[PDB]
Every structure is written in C-alpha cells, then in structure tokens.
Design a binder for this molecule. Structure first.
Ligand SMILES: [Zn+2]
Ligand SMILES: [Zn+2]
Ligand SMILES: [Zn+2]
Length: 178
C-alpha cells in the first residue's frame, strides 16, 4: 500500500485498501472508512467494479438524463466519488468549510454552499436525484465567482470548477463533444 493518504497526500493514521494499493485517512475517504469489513475495498475499487460489471455504462450519456437519475446506490456512490475527486485537489481547501463574506463592494451569496455541507448532505441521504448534488457543487463555484468579482482570487473558483466538471464527465460517462 501507499504510505500517504490518496486524498490529502499526508501521512498519519491510514486505512489501507485490500484490492488496490491506495490508503486513506478515515474522514478523507468518502464514505468515511467503514468500521469492520475485511476485506475492505476503497471507493476507487468500487467504482471500477460497477464499470466492469456493466461495460456499456461507459457509453456516452446526455447530462440532462444523468441529472434526472434518482439517487439509487450506484448513483450515490458515483456522487461520493466525484466529491472525493474534488477534495483530492489541494485547492479544495478554499471551498471546504463554511465561508463568510465581508468585502468592500460585494454582498455575500443568498445561498452559501461549501464542500463539507455537500459531504454531510450525501451522508444524510438528502439528495433524491443526481441534479441536487450537481446543483450544490456548481453553486459553490458560482457564489465564489460572483463575490470575488474582478479580484484575481476568482480564478480559484474556475480552477476547482474545472476539476469538478472534468471528473463529472468521466464518472458519469458524459458523451464527448467539441
Ligand atoms: Zn487524508
Ligand atoms: Zn482500492
Ligand atoms: Zn451489463
């Protein structure tokens, strides 16, 4: 196994996957590393199994159809994995915890949103369709763009949004386009 967490790239108290060489801090894995279960298989491995069981699941899809899917167990997992892929980028630090807004010339968003809030909402099964999860993820970055206006810090929102969107297209096998 690796000797650093796959998500935050730090050492510490790590749980090792039985079917691949990745390792995780307990609360870095999503869902949080399960208490018992020997063997244990990480989210990467679980996602690969879905693909392997249904190879056709990698054929192109329309985003509109994906968003209307109900949050059954496999879509729950996919959203968990997509959230984890965002936390994998160090720039997610800026969007992890609850923000506050006091900048001359700007007003805070009407509906603040942050990664840990999305993580809790997934854990508590609050989303009934993929659309709910995707809307809250895109809201994170849209709120940031609007608030930071012409400050160069706006770029951090563009950057992390691009990681989300690339991963969304990959995990949900969105049909490639020009
Ligand atoms: Zn970690
Ligand atoms: Zn694994
Ligand atoms: Zn099949």
């Amino acid at each position: 196994n690796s000797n650093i967490c796959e998500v935050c790239n730090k050492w510490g108290r790590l749980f090792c996957c039985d079917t691949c060489p990745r390792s995780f801090h307990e609360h870095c894995h999503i869902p949080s590393v399960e208490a018992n279960k020997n063997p244990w298989s990480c989210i990467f491995c679980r996602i690969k199994t879905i693909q392997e069981r249904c190879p056709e699941s990698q054929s192109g899809h329309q985003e509109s159809e994906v968003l209307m899917r109900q949050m059954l167990p496999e879509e729950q997992l996919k959203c968990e994995f997509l959230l984890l892929k965002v936390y994998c980028d160090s720039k997610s630090c800026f969007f992890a915890s609850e923000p506050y807004y006091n900048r001359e010339g700007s007003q805070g968003p009407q509906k603040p949103m942050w990664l840990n809030k999305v993580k809790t909402s997934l854990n508590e099964q609050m989303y009934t369709r993929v659309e709910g999860f995707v809307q809250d993820m895109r809201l994170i970055f849209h709120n940031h763009k609007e608030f930071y206006r012409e400050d160069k810090f706006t770029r951090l929102g563009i950057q992390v949004q691009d990681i989300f969107e690339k991963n969304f297209r990959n995990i949900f096998a969105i049909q490639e386009t020009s």
